């Protein structure tokens, strides 16, 4: 009786929620040949009560998620036929529009399904900080990915410019003080350069000791802040070879940051009003915009 075989396979899948191999089924039921077990598995897959997984150990057969229920009003079929791609999205989330498009259902049905799933604590809706258009839906147990939502800089879908400004100012002050101490040490140029260098872990621990904000700042956060400072033309980073130490971030490589003065002072072009003029293209000898009746140079000479 193949029905008994299917029932036994379903019971075995109930016993092992993580899935069962063909070896487990053969050990539990040795008197049945492999062909009958294969036909039973094919029927179970055809009727939609089993799912196949391909692991490094082979093939696994897992019972389809039906016990985990959040929307039992109506049909469990649509509940699982939404929770499926809900879980498939998982940490990255998925907007309600994309859920509707993948489910090929009207807006009312999917709204009811999402509400009922939120009622029984199966899905959580979080606001997409990348593009504040709709609320993405994720699994309640899964931790929200920092890229799609949250982040040390974003606070309630609002970028904190003051926070990053304070971070940049404090890091630059620390690096400038370290470089000043290295210069005043004047023990040896190599030693001076090594002391002016500051590791990412060191400045990260310094910022943690400062405690400007309540949110915990990881090492890579301070690394990105220092990279933005590098992009400002104020500090310099060098990658040295170090197998292991107090940082242990990059394999065999450590980033050292030092405050460095600019190459050259502001050029002579910016000291003239013509170099900073926004309507410089419309300049002409005889016309409405002329150097003779210029307001910029007038205010500049008056000042």
């Amino acid at each position: 009786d193949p029905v008994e075989i299917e029932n036994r396979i379903i019971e075995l899948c109930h016993q092992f929620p993580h899935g069962i191999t063909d070896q487990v089924i053969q050990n539990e039921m040795p008197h049945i040949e492999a062909q009958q077990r294969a036909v039973a598995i094919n029927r179970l897959l055809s009727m939609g009560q089993l799912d196949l997984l391909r692991s490094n150990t082979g093939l696994l057969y897992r019972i389809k998620d039906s016990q985990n229920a959040g929307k039992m009003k109506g049909s469990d079929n649509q509940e699982k036929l939404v929770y499926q791609i809900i879980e498939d999205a998982g940490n990255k989330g998925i907007w309600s529009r994309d859920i509707r498009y993948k489910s090929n259902l009207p807006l009312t049905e999917i709204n009811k399904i999402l509400k009922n799933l939120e009622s029984k604590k199966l899905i959580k809706a979080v606001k997409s900080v990348a593009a504040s258009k709709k609320k993405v839906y994720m699994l309640y147990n899964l931790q929200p990915d920092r890229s799609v939502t949250g982040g040390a800089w974003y606070s309630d879908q609002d970028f904190e410019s003051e926070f990053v400004e304070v971070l940049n100012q404090q890091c630059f002050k620390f690096l400038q003080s370290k470089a000043e101490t290295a210069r005043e040490s004047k023990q040896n140029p190599m030693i001076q350069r090594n002391s002016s260098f500051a590791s990412s872990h060191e400045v990260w621990k310094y910022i943690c000791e400062l405690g400007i904000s309540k949110v915990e700042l990881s090492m890579e956060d301070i690394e990105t802040i220092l990279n933005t400072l590098i992009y400002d033309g104020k500090v310099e980073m060098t990658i040295i070879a170090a197998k292991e130490g107090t940082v242990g971030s990059v394999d065999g490589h450590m980033k050292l940051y030092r405050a460095v003065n600019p190459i050259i002072p502001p050029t002579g072009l910016v000291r003239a009003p013509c170099g900073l003029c926004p309507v410089f293209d419309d300049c002409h000898e005889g016309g409405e915009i002329s150097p003779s009746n210029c307001i910029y140079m007038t205010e500049w000479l008056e000042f």
């Binding site: 799912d51 196949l52 997984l53 391909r54 499926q84 498939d88 489910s103 090929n104 259902l105």
Partner: protein, 51 residues
């Protein structure tokens, strides 16, 4: 050709190509698209092969 592509290296490392669960939604098909699928040649050939 697939075997030759796999044989680009003499020893192939055990690929971590675990089949992520790509169970697609059994979307409710529009009646026009369902009629198109029924009138498709592949559906007729499968129905003939069923016998």
């Amino acid at each position: 050709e697939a075997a030759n592509e796999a044989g680009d290296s003499s020893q192939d490392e055990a690929e971590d190509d675990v089949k992520q669960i790509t169970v697609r939604f059994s979307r409710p098909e529009s009646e026009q698209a369902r009629q198109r699928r029924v009138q498709s040649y592949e559906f007729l050939q499968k129905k003939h092969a069923e016998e």
